Design a protein around this ligand. Structure first.
Ligand SMILES: N#CCc1cc(O)cc2cc(-c3ccc(O)cc3)oc12
Ligand SMILES: N#CCc1cc(O)cc2cc(-c3ccc(O)cc3)oc12
Lengths: 228, 9, 228, 9
């Protein structure tokens, strides 16, 4: 499987955008958390389907597949959110009709913080002018690198995707040096993503214990499956 | 449930 | 300043080997947390000196120097732990007089979890044959990339260190394709260091809230400053 | 502590 075929496959694997409608009235702490949780729940379902399309993913043991998704789901969701908001500074496009202004992060206690780091990483990604093909690779790397014979099969799957990222960057035509430099600049941002994810899940668990919004089923299963 | 979507869907 | 000269200055900034002055003996729960916190406190002092030796770091606004250190200290401590443990599979070499095994990590609730994370990441670096000079760049990057006028200076510095790691990899004389794969494999491990860092903070914060660990001012400050 | 170590040697 050449890198291009792998990239073409992730392109086809892309999940469709989940359409969620913004509440008619101005957000309240509850209505906002309600939309975010409902949106996340729907995208988690598509994420599962998307994961099974990543070449070799289904070949891992069931237990590995679970662990990978449990540990990186929010990172993946956030990577998606950032990509959607790339051409809209100061704006976080959770969904087509669910565009949140940075300021609206005030009706939710402790979420403005997360919103800020999300907008920040997004600006960095914009500054680097992240490309679609790069984005696809990175998102899959997030899933395959969340390791937070099948073990050796995982390392191999991650190399193939990494190999594909390197290929995409090369096809940009910049010097070999700048290719290395671009690769570094992109991956250095996984840390920021992994961080935002850690705060996002903590924040979510808190809203649940707080009774600020009902968190159940898939969403709850993914939430506990990480603080576990 | 997570397992269901992985193996049943 | 060439990448080679920048790498050399990092080698020179390397903090000294630290010991807790503990007579060899079995580890209990109280003696283990007392040692880890006492060790961390001593290393924190040397970490400050280390950072100031990084060209340009002291040129940053005091606000940046503080935020960068308050946010990455645990990761930097753990990166140091992993480089010391690299040539000792199965063991975590916190210090010459503080060598711990996985089983001994069962004497404290919630720590076996993290030891496993650290041991796996260490094993991963070993498999890659992480070189001393690479460790130097990566550790420096952890400090400069924890940034969740002075800003330009920072991006400039981070870029310099990134250029240095690319250089170190280029000197190993491997193919270009394998230089990119190696660069990515090393940077992808930082996500795991950040992850094991977040858990280590959660655990320590819990120990602090329980007043189970002696008062270590610099360590208490770095803990609160960061928790907050 | 941190600030004083950052401002002295
Ligand atoms: N911001 C922030 C952190 C954050 C906190 C929280 O309590 C719930 C959610 C849901 C999403 C979310 C949902 C769908 C996406 O596509 C991306 C993020 O982010 C969240
Ligand atoms: N393992 C683990 C997590 C962990 C938990 C905790 O409650 C205290 C400490 C202190 C250090 C520590 C101290 C010195 C180092 O060089 C590295 C880590 O790690 C810790």
């Amino acid at each position: 499987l050449s890198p291009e075929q792998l990239v073409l496959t992730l392109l086809e694997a892309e999940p469709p955008h989940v359409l969620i409608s913004r509440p008619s009235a101005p957000f309240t702490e509850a209505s906002m958390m309600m939309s975010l949780t409902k949106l996340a729940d729907k995208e988690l379902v598509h994420m599962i389907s998307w994961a099974k399309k990543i070449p070799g993913f289904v070949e891992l043991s069931l237990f590995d597949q679970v662990r990978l998704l449990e540990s990186c789901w929010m990172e993946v969701l956030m990577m998606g959110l950032m990509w959607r908001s790339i051409d809209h500074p100061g704006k976080l496009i959770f969904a087509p009709d669910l565009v949140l202004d940075r300021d609206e992060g005030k009706c939710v206690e402790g979420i403005l913080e997360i919103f800020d780091m999300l907008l920040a990483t997004t600006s960095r990604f914009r500054e680097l002018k992240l490309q679609h093909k790069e984005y696809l690779c990175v998102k899959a790397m997030i899933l395959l690198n969340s390791s937070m014979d099948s073990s050796r099969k995982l390392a191999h799957l991650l190399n193939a995707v990494t190999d594909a990222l390197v290929w995409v960057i090369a096809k940009s035509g910049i010097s070999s040096q700048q290719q290395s430099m671009r690769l570094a600049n992109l991956l250095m941002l996984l840390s920021h993503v992994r961080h935002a994810s850690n705060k996002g899940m903590e924040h979510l668990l808190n809203m649940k214990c707080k009774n600020v919004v009902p968190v159940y089923d898939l969403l709850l299963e993914m939430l506990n499956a990480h603080v576990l | 449930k997570l397992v269901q979507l992985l193996t049943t869907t």
